[model samples]
Target: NLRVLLDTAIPPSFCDTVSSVLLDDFNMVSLIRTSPADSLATIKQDNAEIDIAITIDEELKISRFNQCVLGYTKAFVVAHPQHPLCNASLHSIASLANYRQISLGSRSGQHSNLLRPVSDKVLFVENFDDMLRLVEAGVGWGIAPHYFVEERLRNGTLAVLSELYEPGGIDTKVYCYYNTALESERSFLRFLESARQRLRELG
Candidate 1:
């Protein structure tokens, strides 16, 4: 049987799809989530041998791991129409200082105050979905993966505030990673590549 770890940034739907395939077609017994930083170490330890990890491109730069670029997505700052700053077209980071800003916290047990101006009223959640919900409820403005909120944007539940910021949106690449020692697991890696593509299509 094989074990695997997934980063929290990965969509739960993506996890479910991959698990279904792995469990049914291969001797895969478990699929779980852990800090991206510790995932490689977990695979190295005999007691917690993770065969692979689904992660973002940024985290795969360390030379010890091999990676495959899964896909690309855009990131944006967004808000609900009822939000206080929604109509302001807030181009300046200085203007966002006092308002509540929602951002993503690291699942890896590391500190993550990733936004600018260091807002006095900042809220941190573990995933983009939570940020989307809070922003849609008019709790605050937040950065989100564009595809995760595309349906809501279309339905008018969330509005892209990209127009306000200079160089508004960011391009992000998603990836799947494995320890270089696991070179023998090429077939599993190939399957994950196909699965990642399917997940992107679903998103």
Candidate 2:
């Protein structure tokens, strides 16, 4: 039997995919949606209740646990097509400072401090969905994962401000971690590693 803690930021469909793959060999006793911060806290503290957890924070580290990279992605600034600044030639941080900004906050309610242009008028959202919806409705422009906005960009609801910024986004990597105490669960570990690779392939 195995217990798992997956980050809420990950798509539910992907969770189902990984769960189905694991079901054939292990008794997936419990699976729960946990925030990245909470997951890291529990794992670092060696909580026996959780066997494993996955998150996207590259800065986190635990000596008593095993970790591996799942995949990498780039994030960029995007805005609704009808936004006032949408038609303007965007080129520098000062240009974007004139418009409303939407910021994605962490699970613990902390806004991202990444180096980027932001206006005095800002809305802090807790997740990507909210950020995307607000931007789509012409509320504000914000940074988002490229893949998350691909469909909207294709449909013309969202547009990437490529001319506004040269390197328009940040590169991030996903990771999975498990307690060293569960090191003997070779089959389970192998399955997760394989699933990570599969996720990359699907993306």
Candidate 3:
């Protein structure tokens, strides 16, 4: 048995792939989704109930836990295709200051600087779904993980500003950290190796 904490930003389908792989060995597995801040808080505590927690390179590194890189991805800066910024011939991060920006996570939430708002006026949303809707509704442009917005980009509903600022969007790396104190340590390491291989392929 193993308990897992996953970052809310990760696509939900990833659970199906990873859980399917783990089910053969770990008879029972349970998982929860939370903000990276809350996830890290619970993971850092002494004798916390969670056995595995996912993180990213942008967040602070926790040296005490056993950690490994799962995969690399880009978080895109995007807006509704009809937004004015989408039409601009030349765009830059500074230009975002002129528009109302949508930011991921709570006001004080700890997220990667890659998703930080450039504009002084910002709307903060906690999850990827709300952020996507708001961006499509033209509330403001926001940053989102590649998996969440890749399909939307092809449909022309969302336009990427990532390339305008940096080629291939902003770099981000996924990570897995496990509690060494748990009896499930042996199985958890195997789970991490499988997860790393799976993510790089599917992502």
Q: For this target, which candidate reaches the highest lDDT against the unseen true structure?
A: 3
TM-score of 2: 0.71
lDDT of 1 at 1: 56
Give candidate 2 misplaced runs (Cα > 4 Å).
34-48, 84-99, 111-121, 162-170
TM-score of 3: 0.80
lDDT of 2 by residue, 67-167 (tens): 87766556667888777666647443456777788875444554223322368887776567888999999898887766687789889889777544556
Residue 51's lDDT in candidate 3: 77
Which prediction has more favorable TM-score, 1 or 3?
3
Highest-scoring model, TM-score: 3
Q: What lDDT score is found at residue 115 in candidate 2?
A: 25
Instruction: Write down the TM-score of every candidate.
Output: 0.66, 0.71, 0.80
lDDT for position 65 in model 1: 63
Error of 3 at 80 (Å): 2.0
Assess each prediction's global lDDT (C-alpha) against the native. Answer: 0.65, 0.67, 0.73
Error of 1 at 149 (Å): 1.7
User: Predicted candidate 2: what Cα RMSD to the true structure?
Assistant: 4.0
Worst 10 residues of 1 by lDDT: 108-117
Question: What range of 10 consecutive residues in model 3 has the weakest lDDT sum?
Answer: 106-115
